[PDB]
């Protein structure tokens, strides 16, 4: 659904939302569109191993340099491994093929580090009560620019964290929504089509222009 996201972003950006005579950004908020998952922490150890991350439900994952993934559910033992071609298997930290020993050790180190360091993005949002073993999205791909880290999840979401001012976007093409986390850590979800109708501030508009450039990079 990256193509859908590109359509949604092209459309809002073509509407020049920060040039509305009267910007009514608030009218575009829709709390029912709040994302279920986003990346709360991340660790770039890609010079040797991969990109470790935590989702907001406290699950962990690693996208290894060889394009395989381990997903540790928030029960601390249940595990999914995703091979390069996307083949999925289920196991536990406690019972795993010997061939996965090194990757599991790496997972444990990333998990330990993010258990002990760093803040959780979105910590103000209520922890979800739901099925903690329902299939988790995983990190499909990521990259960094000078300004941001771009994280693309398997549920179609794209998250962009800006390094300098700590602002963040979580874009969902299924809800056709963007969640903006601002410098004060206010977390608000907007329908993109309503940003077209009602406008938005220049800060959000600028970030949505950058977002489109990033989605283009993901599609390339």
């Amino acid at each position: 659904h990256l193509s859908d996201m590109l359509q949604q972003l092209h459309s809002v950006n073509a509407s020049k939302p920060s040039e509305r005579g009267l910007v009514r950004q608030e009218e575009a908020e829709d709390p029912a569109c709040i994302p279920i998952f986003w990346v709360s922490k991340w660790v770039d150890y890609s010079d040797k191993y991969g990109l470790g991350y935590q989702l907001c439900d406290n699950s962990v994952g690693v996208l290894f340099n060889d394009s395989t993934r381990l997903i540790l559910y928030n029960d601390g033992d249940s595990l999914q491994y995703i091979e390069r071609d996307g083949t999925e298997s289920y196991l536990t930290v406690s019972s795993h093929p010997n061939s996965l020993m090194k990757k599991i050790t790496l997972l444990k180190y990333f998990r330990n580090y993010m258990s002990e360091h760093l803040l959780k993005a979105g910590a103000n949002i209520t922890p979800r009560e739901g099925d903690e073993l329902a299939r988790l999205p995983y990190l499909r791909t990521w990259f960094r620019t000078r300004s941001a880290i771009i994280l693309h999840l398997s549920n179609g979401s794209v998250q962009i964290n800006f390094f300098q001012d700590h602002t963040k976007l979580i874009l969902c093409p299924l809800m056709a929504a963007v969640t903006y986390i601002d410098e004060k850590r206010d977390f608000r979800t907007y329908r993109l089509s309503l940003l077209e109708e009602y406008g938005c501030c220049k800060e959000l508009a600028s970030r949505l222009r950058y977002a489109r450039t990033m989605v283009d990079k993901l599609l390339s």
């Binding site: 990346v39 991340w42 660790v43 770039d44 150890y45 760093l118 803040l119 993005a121 880290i149 700590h166």
Partner: peptide, 5 residues
């Protein structure tokens, strides 16, 4: 940055 905030 090599890690988040």
């Amino acid at each position: 940055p090599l890690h988040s905030t």
